[PDB]
Design an enzyme around this catalytic site. Sequence first.
Site, PDB file in Angstrom:
ATOM      1  CG  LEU A  16      12.113 -30.405  17.442  1.00  0.00           C
ATOM      2  CD1 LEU A  16      12.085 -31.860  17.881  1.00  0.00           C
ATOM      3  CD2 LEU A  16      13.513 -29.814  17.621  1.00  0.00           C
ATOM      4  NE  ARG A  45      13.861 -20.137   4.172  1.00  0.00           N
ATOM      5  CZ  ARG A  45      13.737 -21.108   3.256  1.00  0.00           C
ATOM      6  NH1 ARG A  45      14.003 -22.368   3.564  1.00  0.00           N
ATOM      7  NH2 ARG A  45      13.361 -20.815   2.017  1.00  0.00           N
ATOM      8  CG  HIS A 236      21.195 -39.434  25.536  1.00  0.00           C
ATOM      9  ND1 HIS A 236      20.785 -39.974  24.332  1.00  0.00           N
ATOM     10  CD2 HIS A 236      20.800 -38.129  25.546  1.00  0.00           C
ATOM     11  CE1 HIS A 236      20.165 -39.028  23.624  1.00  0.00           C
ATOM     12  NE2 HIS A 236      20.168 -37.875  24.362  1.00  0.00           N
TER      13      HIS A 236
END
EC number: 1.1.1.49
Lengths: 484, 484
Positions: A16, A45, A236
């Site tokens: 993303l 990380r 939505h």
Amino acid sequence: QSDTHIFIIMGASGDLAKKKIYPTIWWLFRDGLLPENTFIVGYARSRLTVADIRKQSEPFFKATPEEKLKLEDFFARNSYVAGQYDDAASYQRLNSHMNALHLGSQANRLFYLALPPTVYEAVTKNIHESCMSQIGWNRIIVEKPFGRDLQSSDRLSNHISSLFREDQIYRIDHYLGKEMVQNLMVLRFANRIFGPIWNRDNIACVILTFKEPFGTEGRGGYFDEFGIIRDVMQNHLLQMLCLVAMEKPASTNSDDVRDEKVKVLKCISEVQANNVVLGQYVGNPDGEGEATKGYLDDPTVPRGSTTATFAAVVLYVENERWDGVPFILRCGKALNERKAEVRLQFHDVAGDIFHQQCKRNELVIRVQPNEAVYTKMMTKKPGMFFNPEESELDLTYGNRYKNVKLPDAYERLILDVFCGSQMHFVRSDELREAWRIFTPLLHQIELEKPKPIPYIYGSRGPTEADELMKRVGFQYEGTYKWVN
Amino acid sequence: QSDTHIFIIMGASGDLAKKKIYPTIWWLFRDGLLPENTFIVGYARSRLTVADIRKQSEPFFKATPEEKLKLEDFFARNSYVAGQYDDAASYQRLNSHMNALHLGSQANRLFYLALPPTVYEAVTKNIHESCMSQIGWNRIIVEKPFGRDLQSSDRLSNHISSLFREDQIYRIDHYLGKEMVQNLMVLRFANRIFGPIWNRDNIACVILTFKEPFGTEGRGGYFDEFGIIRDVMQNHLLQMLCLVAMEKPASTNSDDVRDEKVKVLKCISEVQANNVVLGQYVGNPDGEGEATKGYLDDPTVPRGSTTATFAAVVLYVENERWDGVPFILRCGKALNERKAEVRLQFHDVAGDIFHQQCKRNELVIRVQPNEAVYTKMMTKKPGMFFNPEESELDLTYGNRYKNVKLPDAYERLILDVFCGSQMHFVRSDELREAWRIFTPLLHQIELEKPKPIPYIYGSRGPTEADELMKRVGFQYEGTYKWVN
Ligand SMILES: NC(=O)c1ccc[n+]([C@@H]2O[C@H](COP(=O)([O-])OP(=O)(O)OC[C@H]3O[C@@H](n4cnc5c(N)ncnc54)[C@H](OP(=O)(O)O)[C@@H]3O)[C@@H](O)[C@H]2O)c1
Ligand SMILES: NC(=O)c1ccc[n+]([C@@H]2O[C@H](COP(=O)([O-])OP(=O)(O)OC[C@H]3O[C@@H](n4cnc5c(N)ncnc54)[C@H](OP(=O)(O)O)[C@@H]3O)[C@@H](O)[C@H]2O)c1
């Protein structure tokens, strides 16, 4: 402002961040929309460096040979901090790093949580205790899922609210960021032509639609966990309902608008299974590629899965404006088309003087594709005819607004988070209401595991959906021919 | 029907018959719209023959090499009878001729009075006494002018009504025959979207427009006798007002519709000179051909003429629907464009939440050219904008209804006279009302002879017209940019 701003991408390593968030903030940066004194910090990380993020992300930018902007300027304002999501020292490293940026101590802080939800409490806690500016504002951006039922959504919200004010919580629904979804308020409350008709005396039903022509495409295991209504309907579509149904707010101020949306939601009862049709797509023996495969022909989807890929549902807003008016919520995967849409079907004209030749008016706001507003209408049949027939008045952004770049939802919304505008962001009370409406349905399904109705890849979904719409008073014709 | 039909062109020699009526009935004939058993009889003083009318008229037809239809069939069904307009024997020759047609005694009779009005009483009387079918119906078609003030219009109407029932009188206003003018009823009463707004709570003013870009073109002497308001305003524009303002009729039946139109007219007071601006065109020194010449530079126009070529006038309908709502009637010659049009300017939205950035909605029905319905509107400015701006929803017949032949007014109306439909034809009471409203203004002008305001060939007319519209509450912006 001249204030310094720090945009923290929590989860900078992942997909993303790589393909949406880094590109999005780039594009904002590129277009002179951010503050001048803006820095981007990634936190994940992996032991990464700004070079490793540039190589990940800049194939997703509008890589153009005008790249001074890109030239480190954008990347020079990037840094990266490696760290675990519930390691306290890590957040000291992060906070301390932010502090050593130019006026880092003063700067406004905007933490984008591009992380899976199994870590939202840890990350949130850690931010609160160790990483909050003491001078500038502190804003957190959180992605769906926000829980999977009332009780689980309550857990998360009570956690976040204990740490952060509502002032500080920006829950994104990418729907609120679309051109046409933002337009609903303007269409309704900037215009007299609509508005006096915007009520149960004039409207027979509201259809709220969201269709995708692709199936699940190898990612069915992920989808199978929540299904279509958690996916699309409780967020939505119910958002679109709110913007449609809303009383006029006292002002465009962010919380005068949102407290109209919750107000509506509060007049909607828990949905009953009488008013639901559920579907699961089977493949098309006469199809092309992916379209041959049913939902169960993903090896990612567990055998005998009952998860629904289509749902139509009828809600009612028990108030003065809408009493009796069915609000049909209709969505699905592996359908005939990509579309998201608002439609009002108006009542028959009272005291008909043409001879059952009239057809109900409709007002269509097509959110995607091909952003359009049109009203389906009656005109006199052109020529030597005394008859009415169906026609329309059209606004199609493709043609009228030909050279106008429409931003992606994430461009708009993230900009809103810098400018401090919560209008287009799911409030806590809203989110509770949303869960209340759908939760007992959701659990009914989990418990009793009803077989969803089969429909073919590329169909309009199960025919039982149409019978439901007809039973609450939608009327479909056959007669409306459009050209152009 | 199988009934025989006789269409008598009284005044078959003249220009209207040569270039309008003969062509029009041809085209009706050609397209299979008339009854099968139809005969055309011309009646005028000149000693003409069907050959002489074919040679006059068929350059005005759609002369196509598919002309069996034309081949005598149309002309074989033509005959001609010479005759004086108040010679009794002549009407015996005519009646007797009609009788000797196939079932001539039975046939329905339709007398088109394509004659100047100085002869309408004679012709009418003579028809009544000597030429009426005793079996079939008898219908007379009469053209403007219908009088030039109340008292003169009363004379003509009392004459005609003494001889003919209202059932029998088809006074043509070619305006009622236009596509868009017929559409007003359908737009309004076949649609809920309009209609609940169709009232003084929602509308700030109605503008009724009729513009021509050509001046008077050598025929100024003819025009000078009556002027613009007799020409265009008391008929065409006041008709549009009626269709706009009308309560919903009990049925589409011809006299339920017309008694709504008179009902409106009865709530309109005699117009006062406070609410009038009059104009006369002067030529453009920077112009092209005809456009250089003012109204007074026709040698046909008497020197020092005061006749107005532009008039704006404000009327009010004193009833529940329209109390206070100005109805601006605006027309002229030698203007910037050809246009005829209905516009509603709606009131400001109540309780503005955008910041005086809204603009009043408008509903425009453009009758000519380029038949269109559109609503001027507010949408959210496409892109990264939170602002409303002006836009519209469009129906343009040019594009949507691309291959649809729209008939000429005279095709529609004359067909209506065969089919026995008076809806689109000025009733006696209507015509009285029309004269009542304008007569004391008309006489005021005849008496006191005010100097009309100069305006340049191709301008929008006198600026004082705009000040009048603004004074009654029309609001013009500058801001509405259309493209496409
Ligand atoms: N410039 C423009 O953007 C513009 C303007 C006007 C029209 N158009 C196009 O014209 C077409 C027709 O317009 P429209 O969709 O508003 O009108 P429509 O064909 O009357 O669609 C009406 C609705 O009926 C639903 N429906 C319910 N029961 C049905 C049944 N038994 N059979 C079929 N449909 C049933 C359809 O679902 P579905 O949603 O599943 O079809 C649809 O939402 C569309 O493709 C539209 O994009 C485009
Ligand atoms: N597809 C289509 O058919 C379509 C759709 C939308 C728009 N359009 C075009 O877009 C253009 C603009 O639309 P519109 O005419 O509805 O909007 P507009 O320019 O706002 O016209 C509004 C009205 O203001 C009047 N007016 C009064 N005081 C005025 C003043 N001081 N200065 C200027 N005008 C004043 C104008 O008179 P006038 O009548 O003398 O100008 C006109 O009727 C037109 O050419 C129209 O044909 C076409």
